[PDB]
């Protein structure tokens, strides 16, 4: 046993909004006497194969396969066999490896219900990049939760805010939010695909003389600290349990490495609704 | 030769605004046939010593010692000897190792001159965490550049925006910017310690009915993409050459590993002024 865990990640050099998983892994590692080595594939199957080979060569005890955003994918390990736990992603092949992911659907559901229980009936939703699985699941939740409550597609204002390659998108959130807020039947609440996008929606609203809670409520998603605590009023959002995913994933890998009869399958960790002050009745 | 470079970083799990250095290193590595393994010290001398030992054990060809923010520090490698190049930091011991850093002073100087050449005479500056070397150097530049031009301390509005442990500060940027903008002799331009802080200054200004370029110009620092392109108007700033620091640092390490008579000493890469539309005459 080298007591070294290897993390194979995909887009960490271009996606720094998921480092909290690493933070969770590292924190757990420091409390359990293990060292962590990180390798990035950049999304290349070729380089990934080579990385697995490298880890075998270095006698890594286990691997935490971590994706920057939620994905469904089978790792490309060639002929390498090392105990592995997937975090923030799920294998394409049923039960190929144990996995732990955040519940985008539940989070969006609870955030939508939050607004509904707060009197909002005309709700807007500006979509995160459609290529993202998480983006679509959050939208799926918004659509059904609002229908289950009674609102009709006619009470909603849904618009795309961006498209293109992740982390290099054609971004028009500000323009989309502006059009949405200038509508004759202006929504009273707007749900942002994620916290990052909320920055543009806050500016769009204020640029039209609207006061946040008072004139329009805004909620985000992720609890990306850099943003949520920068915006004023403080942004009410759904926190992706990244830190916990990392800590839980690491412990799980540790038990798997030590044997243990832990039925793999998939674990899904809930997203905590973080109530701040960007929404009003 | 393993053709593997190791990156020893400090606060990457809690500071994701410097991943671009890694992006630059990784990009160079992919174009030169090398693999990159990353290890984080979390700021612990103890864990760092152990990490150097680990790298020696794994036969890493060289190390890129990268700090999340600009620092002056001697690596704690114990008895380990491996070709090393420092990036975004400088050794405490004169010429202990080659190093390449961004020029915070030059960047702040050019950004201050930018405003001065644009008619501004009453300028505000909201300070980044004073514990940060970079924060102080940018302030040093603002102070002398404004004096060299002719303005007096009396024409400036300088205030702290935060303090405490980096990445866990007591943050009052919004409140400080609000007080500053409510002054009877309101500054016409405000320089933000960094781009992240600009989010709060934009909101502070708009919350008072002020229009950005029209009523008050705002410039930032870093060119933290997540922010600069989210704020509207687009934020004029000084770009920290992170990507280039990584690419240059990696090449430099490569030459050092291959021998080459490259006088170590320190290299300082300029910060590019990125003109957008958050400032007006």
């Amino acid at each position: 046993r080298s007591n070294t865990f290897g993390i194979i990640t995909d887009y960490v050099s271009t996606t720094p909004y998921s480092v909290d998983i690493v933070r969770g892994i590292q924190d757990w590692a420091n409390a359990n006497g293990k060292t962590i080595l990180i390798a990035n594939t950049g999304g290349s199957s070729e380089r990934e194969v080579e990385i697995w080979k490298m880890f075998q060569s270095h006698r890594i005890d286990g691997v935490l396969y971590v994706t920057m955003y939620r994905r469904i994918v089978d790792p490309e390990s060639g002929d390498v066999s090392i105990p592995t736990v997937m975090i923030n992603c799920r294998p394409q092949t049923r039960e190929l490896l144990p996995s732990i992911e955040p519940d985008d659907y539940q989070g969006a559901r609870d955030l939508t219900r939050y607004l509904l229980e707060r009197g909002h009936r005309r709700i807007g939703y500006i979509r995160l990049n459609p290529i993202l699985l998480g983006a679509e699941l959050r939208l799926d939740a918004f659509r059904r939760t609002t229908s289950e409550f009674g609102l009709t597609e006619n009470d909603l204002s849904i618009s795309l805010g961006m498209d293109g390659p992740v982390g290099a998108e054609n971004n028009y959130v500000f323009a989309a939010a502006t059009e949405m807020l200038k509508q004759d039947d202006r929504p009273t609440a707007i749900m942002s695909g994620n916290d990052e996008m909320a920055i543009q929606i806050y500016i769009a609203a204020m640029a039209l003389g609207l006061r946040i809670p008072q004139d329009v409520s805004i909620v985000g998603f992720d609890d990306f600290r850099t943003v949520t605590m920068a915006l004023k009023p403080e942004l009410t959002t759904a926190a992706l349990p990244y830190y916990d995913l990392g800590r839980e994933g690491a412990k799980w890998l540790n038990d798997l490495i030590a044997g243990e009869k832990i039925y793999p399958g998939s674990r899904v960790v809930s997203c905590k609704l973080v109530e701040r002050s960007s929404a009003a009745f």
Side-chain angles (χ1 to χ4, degrees), chain A:
Chain A
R1 291 289 162 291
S2 66
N3 289 317
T4 300
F5 284 0
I7 296 180
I8 294 183
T9 184
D10 50 9
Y11 309 106
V12 74
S13 70
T14 178
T15 296
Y17 328 128
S18 312
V19 300
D20 247 45
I21 293 173
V22 185
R23 175 195 160 207
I25 298 295
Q26 192 73 65
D27 278 8
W28 181 87
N30 298 335
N32 292 269
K34 293 160 202 305
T35 54
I36 301 298
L37 280 178
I38 305 175
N40 198 54
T41 70
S44 165
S45 287
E46 292 52 63
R47 303 199 201 98
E48 184 181 339
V49 176
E50 165 177 48
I51 290 174
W52 282 97
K53 211 167 299 300
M54 162 167 283
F55 278 150
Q56 182 178 63
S57 169
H58 286 285
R59 317 308 177 193
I60 294 301
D61 290 340
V63 168
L64 291 167
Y65 198 81
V66 184
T67 52
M68 287 300 100
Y69 45 84
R70 204 172 168 184
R71 297 175 55 197
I72 296 174
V73 56
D74 269 14
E76 284 290 295
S77 55
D79 294 307
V80 175
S81 172
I82 302 179
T84 300
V85 171
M86 295 175 72
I87 304 165
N88 204 203
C89 54
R90 148 191 34 180
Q92 183 54 290
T93 294
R94 180 177 71 72
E95 309 201 72
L96 186 69
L97 294 164
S99 61
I100 187 165
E101 302 165 280
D103 203 328
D104 289 82
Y105 191 88
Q106 162 271 315
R109 170 175 71 236
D110 290 340
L111 204 44
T112 299
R113 293 171 54 89
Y114 174 93
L115 291 173
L116 299 175
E117 306 184 313
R118 301 302 191 298
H120 300 285
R121 303 285 184 271
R122 294 180 175 178
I123 312 295
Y125 188 92
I126 303 184
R127 304 169 61 184
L128 177 64
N129 198 327
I131 187 176
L132 294 179
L133 173 68
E136 213 61 25
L137 294 179
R138 299 173 190 180
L139 174 62
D140 287 339
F142 177 63
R143 286 178 185 288
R144 182 184 171 66
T145 57
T146 176
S147 277
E148 180 179 58
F149 181 77
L151 300 184
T152 72
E153 202 62 289
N154 195 287
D155 301 315
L156 302 331
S157 281
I158 305 176
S159 308
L160 286 173
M162 68 179 73
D163 54 57
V166 179
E169 298 109 321
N170 167 22
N171 185 303
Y172 40 94
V173 184
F174 178 78
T178 292
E179 184 57 46
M180 184 180 287
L181 289 165
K182 285 193 296 184
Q183 294 179 300
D184 294 297
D185 285 314
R186 185 172 70 201
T188 64
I190 291 178
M191 290 187 75
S192 181
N194 68 9
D195 300 331
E196 195 174 314
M197 298 171 70
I199 296 169
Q200 296 186 60
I201 302 173
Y202 263 56
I203 299 183
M206 297 178 85
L208 293 172
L210 297 174
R211 306 176 181 185
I212 307 301
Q214 186 188 307
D215 295 334
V216 63
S217 292
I218 299 175
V219 298
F221 207 116
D222 292 359
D223 193 31
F224 178 32
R225 312 86 154 69
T226 295
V227 178
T228 63
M229 294 182 89
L231 303 175
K232 305 293 181 178
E234 291 291 62
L235 188 66
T236 289
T237 190
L240 281 172
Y242 281 153
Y243 182 72
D244 292 323
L245 282 173
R247 296 186 56 67
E248 284 298 309
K251 181 187 176 177
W252 203 8
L253 176 61
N254 195 59
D255 298 329
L256 184 67
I257 295 168
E260 286 302 294
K261 295 187 71 299
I262 293 298
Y263 283 119
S266 169
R267 291 179 176 181
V268 186
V269 179
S270 60
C271 293
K272 295 177 178 176
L273 178 40
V274 181
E275 180 162 34
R276 297 209 170 87
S277 54
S278 60
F281 190 90

